[PDB]
């Protein structure tokens, strides 16, 4: 791709100059993720086609990989609750898919597309780099604190298990 | 007073400095009385 | 004393890297 | 497929105050965290 | 035409790379010897006996330092206020065990630093300029004179002087902390407004004139090619500037004069450093900050806690630790 | 002895200040040059470079 | 520009740079979105920090 | 007390005086 | 031996202080 | 949780930085070389707006 | 003309106090913040929380009050006044600490507010925006001392208290609990605050002393127009006076003003990263090496020992009244102690 | 030790001296303004 | 080089603002006055009077323990 | 359905109707009051 | 010349001096408080 | 494995040096 950077897909055919239609990459890509969030939760996390993911008692004695079914409750939104991974998995994944056919059909507002620079590639690394702090703050949170994503079998005890003596208790 | 309908600047600054530093004077009082004196 | 095994490259290393970067930049300007 | 030149290349320059100040900045930083590297 | 006169004109010529001056000749000699014997002693020096209690401390990289850890360690609480040069010990041994090193650091380092202030005024004459560059550097000489010889004259000691060193200077803030509460004392509080609003004030005119840049370059090349060295015209907009910071707050909380806002500049953080280092040179005759310790009692006279107490106990942690086998009574008075 | 020592330690040093600020600026008007550099004869650009 | 079988492919694909919805288009809609966005993470966010409490779970790693 | 009132009495006197001269002194246009 | 890493950094720094003075790019009015 | 941690508070500048070059990249290079009617008060009655200039 | 650009106009309109967009999220919570610790230090006590007095009614002074932490039991809980602790009892809400999230919160808004003000402002005037670029080393300071360091830790009762010698208090308490001075990210943080300091005092001093005699006056302030176009001191002059007085100096006065901008906001980022570290008691609290060669030989001392001891110290005396939660009995005999103190 | 002395003692009077008698040289005239005083 | 507001000095030196001020400005100094001085400050922001900081039957500082009856706790503390 | 619940539903109703909706609503109505003459 | 008396300046100016006044009179009445 | 403990630093800086003087030298060439 460095030595052959001069392919005729990069250049728009109105002009002569170079054009990415980002708004159309980012439904192509979204979709995508949409696709590929919910296939991990439907097949590799639920065990239909996949091994599951870790999951374990209360106290990191049994740990083990098992399919785990999705939890379309309240309580899917228990954090030490792996059925709410699945669910988010499924559903997240079901909205991508809904929102890249939207980002794949429909064409930005003017208003928008001015306003927030949609020309400009700098705009998608601007909210990307956004998203991508967002989401390192929630993983740093959810290590620190505990998750069913990260369990003491795998990452060690917390803090706050010492803090508040559960295993002592 | 001078100035016809109209107070001097300065006498305004002069009444609202002499407050000002009249409350300060107040608190500063209230250090060693009452409330947090220490007695 | 008892000090870090790595301690001795991890400092060279660490001071002479971009030193070597800061040394290839300078010497091909103007170019 | 042919291998056509890019127009996009531009030379990087860095002159001789940037250098210093840069060979500083790397030589207190090791100075700084050359302790706690040893620790 | 006389030889003293050639010697007059070279000392205090413009043309100089490094400028000499009058002051330069104590200047230069003085400090470069407080910077060979402190290079030395930083990398060799054996352990001093700072407390006078025949307890060595271990200051130099050879003798198990880090950079960190290493200090010139201040001289004997023994010699006190005393002058300790080389010729006044019976070996240069004992010299060493003594802390003589940083009595001859320290007393070189300082006469180096008042005439480099001279220094300054004496180049700002000869290239006709202002003169008082030479005043805002004294807050710096003011900050380490108090730290290295008022601190010590006060408390009867250069064992109390801050030590040539990053830990020894922790050591320093803590223990004077724990004997003079520096952080409840307003002039610290001066200090850090000081320096707080001196690196805001750096910050806000580094932005402010960043921001309003005169277009001169393109976004391939840096931004400061856009300024030529001895040009006549302004490289930026004061008047944007302006336009942008009095929108910011309002109209005139901002500087529309370049003078006055650069005289506020300088005078701000060397103003809160004259106070701060006059704070250290009061607290060296134990004026001290604020005691507010059971300042509120209840209506029966049961002490209500404040801020202030949890801070004293944790000085009361600091003062019962500190130079632990030093003491022999029961109140540090020195 | 406190409040004496402090005291006269600050007014000294502030009088210091005002030594080099008063000295400095008794120089720069018997000089001549106290209200700022002249654009014409500017001592610098008469002056060789330094290096 | 070279002409690659994938290129042609992918051409309709990267065809409509600059294209817009002339003026608000479906901004109300979006901003609808955000808000419930808004309100789905301040609940999850609530639940974590056991602010807002439920039934049938509580937030544990007994669960 | 008594003693706090004539003090402050005596403060307020004292802090009208000076204002006081250069009131008459701005008022009748004296060599201000 | 860490003393000698020590020496070593020290010593870069004092060096470059002294090729950043006496080898400096000289300022020029163009 | 401290990498994560870290990486995720300087990539909050890397945010501020690319998002102000993107709205600012016609002054990037700098400012335009007149800038002084636009910016002065109490001109206009819209701040930077031409078309709102009060002319009292 | 639609709703939305009139109000863009009304929003944008040049007057005392600029408003904007940012201004609905500015001028509310700043409002919130400000006031919340007005209120706070005014009236409102720490006595359930930190059996402390801290406000202007318990006979506390300006030095002494302070919008104290939550308490420790309640953990990160955001503590909202319709929340499960207070659930609507603002009484209550005063006494269990929610003036603390309250105005951590509402001040963290009021920054975000702040930062889009002067994004909004910039663009507006013309101007680029790095008033806002430099103004992010704040916003770090804040976010990981206020919000990240109690987050790593058990509770918002560890963060900083909004107050000035509960601002000590906290200082005190990463100096003997973390060694915080050990830090090198602090180092730096100190580097840039004192340097930035002395980029202020230099070039202000620098400036006003290489002026050029432009008027008549002693008074040398009004010589200067901001509508001229020439420097009003000589780059000349000060460039060879800093030369030879100190080896080197600026000759590029854009260089000057974006390293002016440069140190203290790097400081202020490196100084956040190291309490990050701090936040998860991520240390830098021991050199390995001399506690060893110190645990075997009992002659070698140095000071980074010594400080070492001074830490130990102020947390055996301080942590029974600093953490009243715990409920830390710790006898006269086991407090650590030099001889005949 | 005493030659140490008598040579830092020689040392400093000399620098002094040349501080003292360089500044007693009409050094209000060595500047690039007006020099007659 | 005025935004178009009345400027702050024309309106300090008016009688009509020292006419209202001469009310205003001491109405609420004694306002904070009141609400210091009848004691409903106390209540309002549940600060204690200096002789409820220690009662009869609680001589310890009343650290709140409990995650969410903070109420009861308080009463119990009274 | 809890009491945590339904406090934070007001929370959301109140939030709206003190701060958002009036501050809207004040908005809209002195921009569209005190327009600007072009 | 006919300015007007209300604006977001007055509005400003009395959001913070309003109880900035209260605020002060009540720490006066505090100061007489005994304990 | 009892390896020599300047091994690894020997090995690393035996390599780099030259690999930085032939770096340096083919990226400022045509100057
Ligand atoms: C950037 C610049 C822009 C500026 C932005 C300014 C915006 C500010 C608004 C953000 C406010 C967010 C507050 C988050 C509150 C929180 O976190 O509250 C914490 C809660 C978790 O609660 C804690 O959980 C702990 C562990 O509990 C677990 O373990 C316990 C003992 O084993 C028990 O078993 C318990 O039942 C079980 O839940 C303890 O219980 C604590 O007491 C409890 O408070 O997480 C949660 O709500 C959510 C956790 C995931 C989200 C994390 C995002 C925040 C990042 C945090 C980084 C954390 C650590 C790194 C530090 C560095
Ligand atoms: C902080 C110290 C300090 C500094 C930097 C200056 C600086 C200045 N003085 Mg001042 N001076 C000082 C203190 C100082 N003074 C004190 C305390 C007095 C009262 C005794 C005077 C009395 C004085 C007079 C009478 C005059 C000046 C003048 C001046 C200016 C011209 C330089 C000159 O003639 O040298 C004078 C410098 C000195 C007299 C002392 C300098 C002290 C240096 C900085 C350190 C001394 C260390 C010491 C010599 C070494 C230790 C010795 C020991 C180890 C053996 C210059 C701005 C002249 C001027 O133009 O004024 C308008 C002038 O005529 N000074
Ligand atoms: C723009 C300004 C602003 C912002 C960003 C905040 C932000 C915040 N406030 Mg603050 N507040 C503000 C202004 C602001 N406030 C003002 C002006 C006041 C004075 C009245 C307060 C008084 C206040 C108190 C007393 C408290 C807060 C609290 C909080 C925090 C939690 C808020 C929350 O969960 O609300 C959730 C609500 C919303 C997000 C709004 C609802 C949004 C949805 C999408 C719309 C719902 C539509 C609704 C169903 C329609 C029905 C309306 C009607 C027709 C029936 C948060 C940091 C709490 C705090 O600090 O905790 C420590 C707290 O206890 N605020
Ligand atoms: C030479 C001495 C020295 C110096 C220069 C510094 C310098 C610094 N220290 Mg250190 N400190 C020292 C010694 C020193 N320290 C010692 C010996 C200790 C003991 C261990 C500490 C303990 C210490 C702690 C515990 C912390 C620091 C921190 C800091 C940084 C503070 C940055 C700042 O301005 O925050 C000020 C705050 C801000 C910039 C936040 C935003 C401020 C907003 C904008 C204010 C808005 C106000 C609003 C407009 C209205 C206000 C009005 C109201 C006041 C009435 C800075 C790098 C902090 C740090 O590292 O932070 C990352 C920190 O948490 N220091
Ligand atoms: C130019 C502007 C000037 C304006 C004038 C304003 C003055 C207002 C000042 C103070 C207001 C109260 C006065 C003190 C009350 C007297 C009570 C008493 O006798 O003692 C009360 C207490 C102890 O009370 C003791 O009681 C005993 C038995 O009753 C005896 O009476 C003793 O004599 C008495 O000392 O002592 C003090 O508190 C005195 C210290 C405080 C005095 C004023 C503090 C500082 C005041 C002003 C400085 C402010 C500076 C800010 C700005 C500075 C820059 C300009
Ligand atoms: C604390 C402070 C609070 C601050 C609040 C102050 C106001 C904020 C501004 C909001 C701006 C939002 C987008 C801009 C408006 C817009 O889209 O264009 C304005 C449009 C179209 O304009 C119309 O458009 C027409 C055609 S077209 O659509 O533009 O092509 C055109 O003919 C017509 O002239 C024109 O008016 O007008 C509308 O139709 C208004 C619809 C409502 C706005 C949508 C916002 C979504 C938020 C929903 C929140 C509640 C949801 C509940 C969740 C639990
Ligand atoms: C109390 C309400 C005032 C708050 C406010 O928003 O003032 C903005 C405007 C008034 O000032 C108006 O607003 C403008 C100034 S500004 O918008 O306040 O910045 C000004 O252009 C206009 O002539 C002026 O009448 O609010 C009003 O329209 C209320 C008119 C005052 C009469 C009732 C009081
Ligand atoms: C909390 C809260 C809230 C809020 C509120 C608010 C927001 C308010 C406020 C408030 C305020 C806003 C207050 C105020 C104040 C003030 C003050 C307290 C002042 C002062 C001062 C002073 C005392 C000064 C002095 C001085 C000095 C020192 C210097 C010089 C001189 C003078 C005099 C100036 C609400 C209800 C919503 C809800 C609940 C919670
Ligand atoms: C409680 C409300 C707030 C109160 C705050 C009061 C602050 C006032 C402090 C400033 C004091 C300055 O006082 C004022 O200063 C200006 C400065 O040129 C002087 O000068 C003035 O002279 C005359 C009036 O005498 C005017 O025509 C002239 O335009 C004006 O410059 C005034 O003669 C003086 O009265
Ligand atoms: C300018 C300063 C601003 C700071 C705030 C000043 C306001 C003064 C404080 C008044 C406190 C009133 O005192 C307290 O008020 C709350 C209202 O929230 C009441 O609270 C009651 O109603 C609320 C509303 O549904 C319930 O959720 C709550 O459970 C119940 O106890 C308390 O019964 C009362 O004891
Ligand atoms: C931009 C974001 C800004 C948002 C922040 C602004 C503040 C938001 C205020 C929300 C306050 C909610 O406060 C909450 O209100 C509800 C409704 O009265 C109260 O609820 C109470 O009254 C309702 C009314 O019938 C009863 O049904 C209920 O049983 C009772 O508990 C809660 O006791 C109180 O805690
Ligand atoms: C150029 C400017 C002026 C510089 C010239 C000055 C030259 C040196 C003058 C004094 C140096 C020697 O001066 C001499 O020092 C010795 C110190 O060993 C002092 O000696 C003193 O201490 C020694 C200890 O060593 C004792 O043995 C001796 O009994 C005692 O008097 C002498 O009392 C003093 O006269
Ligand atoms: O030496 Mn140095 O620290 Ca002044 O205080 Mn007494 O001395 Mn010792 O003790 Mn605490
Ligand atoms: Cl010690
Ligand atoms: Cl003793
Ligand atoms: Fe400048």
Known sequence: ?169 | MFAEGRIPLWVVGVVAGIGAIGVLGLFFYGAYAGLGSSM | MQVNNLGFIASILFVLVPTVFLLILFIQTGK | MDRNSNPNRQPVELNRTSLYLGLLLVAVLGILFSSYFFN | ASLWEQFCQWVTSTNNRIYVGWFGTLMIPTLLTATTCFIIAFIAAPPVDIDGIREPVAGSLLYGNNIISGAVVPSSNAIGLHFYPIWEAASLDEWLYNGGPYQLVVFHFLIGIFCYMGRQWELSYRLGMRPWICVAYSAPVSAATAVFLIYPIGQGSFSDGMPLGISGTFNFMIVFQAEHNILMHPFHMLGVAGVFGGSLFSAMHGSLVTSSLVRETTEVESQNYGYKFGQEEETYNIVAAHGYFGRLIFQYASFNNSRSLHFFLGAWPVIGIWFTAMGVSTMAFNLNGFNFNQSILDSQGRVIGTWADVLNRANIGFEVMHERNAHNFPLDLA | ?51 | ?63 | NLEPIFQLTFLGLIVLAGPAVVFVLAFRGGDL | ?30 | ?56 | ?341 | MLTLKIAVYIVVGLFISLFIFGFLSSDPTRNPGRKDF | ?78 | ?38 | ?35
Not at chain 11, 4 to 30: E, H, M, N, Q
Not at chain 11, 46 to 66: P, R
Not at chain 11, 139 to 147: D, G, K, M
């Open chain 10, 1 to 56: 949780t401290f990498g994560h941690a870290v990486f995720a508070l300087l990539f909050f500048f890397g945010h501020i930085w690319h998002g102000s070059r993107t709205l600012f990249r016609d002054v990037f290079a700098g400012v335009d070389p007149g800038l002084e009617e636009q910016v002065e008060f109490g001109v206009f009655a819209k701040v930077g707006d031409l078309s709102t200039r009060k002319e009292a």
């Open chain 15, 1 to 35: 010349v006919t300015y007007p008396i209300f604006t977001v300046r007055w509005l400003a100016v009395h959001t913070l001096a309003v109880p900035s006044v209260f605020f002060v009179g009540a720490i006066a009445a505090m100061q007489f408080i005994q304990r």
């Open chain 11, 1 to 341: 003309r639609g709703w939305f650009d009139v109000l863009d106009d009304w929003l944008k309109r040049d007057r005392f106090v600029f408003i904007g967009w940012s201004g609905l999220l500015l001028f509310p919570c700043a409002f919130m913040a400000l006031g919340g610790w007005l209120t706070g230090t005014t009236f409102v006590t720490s006595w359930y929380t930190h059996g402390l007095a801290s406000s202007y009614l318990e006979g506390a002074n300006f030095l002494t009050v302070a919008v104290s932490s939550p308490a420790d039991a309640f953990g990160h809980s955001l503590l909202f006044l319709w929340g499960p602790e207070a659930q609507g009892n603002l009484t209550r809400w005063f006494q269990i600490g929610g003036l603390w999230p309250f105005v951590a919160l509402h001040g963290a808004f009021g920054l975000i507010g702040f930062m889009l003000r002067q994004f909004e402002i910039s663009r507006l005037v013309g101007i680029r925006p790095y008033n806002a670029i430099a103004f992010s080393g704040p916003i770090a300071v804040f976010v990981s001392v206020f919000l990240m360091y109690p987050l790593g830790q058990s509770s918002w009762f560890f963060a900083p208290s909004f107050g000035v010698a509960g601002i000590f208090r906290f200082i005190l308490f990463l100096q003997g609990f973390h060694n915080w001075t050990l830090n090198p990210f602090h180092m730096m943080g100190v580097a840039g605050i004192l340097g930035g300091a002395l980029l202020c005092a230099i070039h202000g001093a620098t400036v006003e002393n290489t002026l050029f005699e432009d008027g008549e006056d002693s008074n040398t302030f009004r010589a200067f127009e901001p509508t001229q176009a020439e420097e009003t001191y000589s780059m000349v002059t000060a460039n060879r006076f800093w030369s030879q007085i100190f080896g080197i100096a600026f000759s590029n006065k854009r260089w000057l003003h974006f390293f002016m901008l440069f140190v203290p906001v790097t400081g202020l980022w490196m100084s956040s990263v190291g309490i990050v570290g701090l936040a998860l008691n991520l240390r830098a609290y021991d050199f390995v090496s001399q506690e060893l060669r110190a645990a075997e030989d009992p002659e070698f001392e140095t000071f980074y020992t010594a400080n070492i001891l001074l830490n130990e110290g102020m947390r055996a005396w301080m942590a029974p009244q600093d953490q009243p939660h715990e409920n830390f009995i710790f006898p006269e005999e086991v407090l650590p102690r030099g001889n005949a103190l």
């Open chain 14, 1 to 38: 359905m809890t009491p945590s619940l339904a406090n934070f539903l007001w929370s959301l109703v109140l939030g709206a109707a003190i701060v958002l909706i009036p501050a809207t609503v004040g908005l809209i109505f002195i921009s569209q009051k005190d327009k600007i003459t072009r």
């Open chain 7, 1 to 63: 520009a070279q002409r690659t079988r994938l290129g042609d492919i992918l051409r309709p694909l990267n065809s409509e740079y600059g294209k817009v919805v002339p003026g608000w288009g479906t901004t109300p809609v979006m901003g609808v979105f955000m808000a419930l966005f808004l309100v789905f993470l301040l609940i999850i966010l609530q639940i974590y920090n056991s602010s807002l409490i439920l039934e049938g779970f509580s937030v544990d790693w007994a669960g």
């Open chain 9, 1 to 30: 031996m860490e003393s000698v890493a020590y020496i070593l950094v020290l010593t870069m720094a004092l060096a470059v202080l002294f090729f950043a003075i006496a080898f400096r790019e000289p300022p020029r009015i163009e």
């Open chain 6, 1 to 51: 002895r406190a409040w004496l020592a402090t005291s006269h330690f600050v007014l000294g040093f502030f009088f210091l200040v005002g030594h080099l600020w008063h000295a400095g600026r008794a120089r720069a008007a018997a000089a001549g040059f106290e209200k700022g550099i002249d654009r014409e004869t500017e001592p610098t650009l008469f002056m060789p470079d330094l290096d």
């Open chain 1, 1 to 169: 791709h460095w030595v052959f950077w001069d392919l005729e897909l990069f250049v728009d055919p109105r002009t002569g100059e170079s054009a990415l239609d980002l708004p159309k990459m980012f439904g192509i890509h979204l979709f995508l993720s949409g696709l590929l969030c919910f296939g991990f939760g439907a097949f590799h996390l639920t065990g239909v086609w996949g091994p599951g993911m870790w999951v374990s008692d209360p106290y990191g004695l049994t740990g083990h990989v098992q399919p785990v079914a999705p939890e379309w409750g309240p309580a899917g939104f228990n954090p030490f609750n792996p059925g709410g991974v699945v669910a988010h998995h499924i559903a997240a994944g079901i909205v991508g898919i809904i929102a890249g056919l939207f980002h794949l059909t429909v064409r930005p507002p003017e208003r928008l597309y001015k306003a927030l620079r949609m020309g400009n590639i700098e705009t998608v690394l601007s909210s990307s780099i956004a998203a991508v702090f967002f989401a390192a703050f929630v993983v740093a949170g959810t290590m620190w604190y505990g998750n069913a994503t990260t369990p003491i079998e795998l990452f060690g005890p917390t803090r706050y298990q010492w803090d508040k003596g559960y295993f002592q208790e």
């Open chain 13, 1 to 78: 080089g005025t935004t178009g507001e009345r400027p702050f000095s024309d309106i300090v030196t008016s009688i009509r603002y020292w006419v209202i001020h001469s009310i205003t400005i001491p109405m609420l100094f004694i306002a904070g006055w009141l609400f210091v001085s009848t004691g409903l400050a106390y209540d309002a922001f549940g600060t204690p009077r200096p002789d409820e900081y220690f009662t009869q039957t609680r001589q310890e500082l009343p650290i709140l323990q409990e995650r969410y009856d903070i109420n009861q706790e308080i009463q119990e503390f009274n």
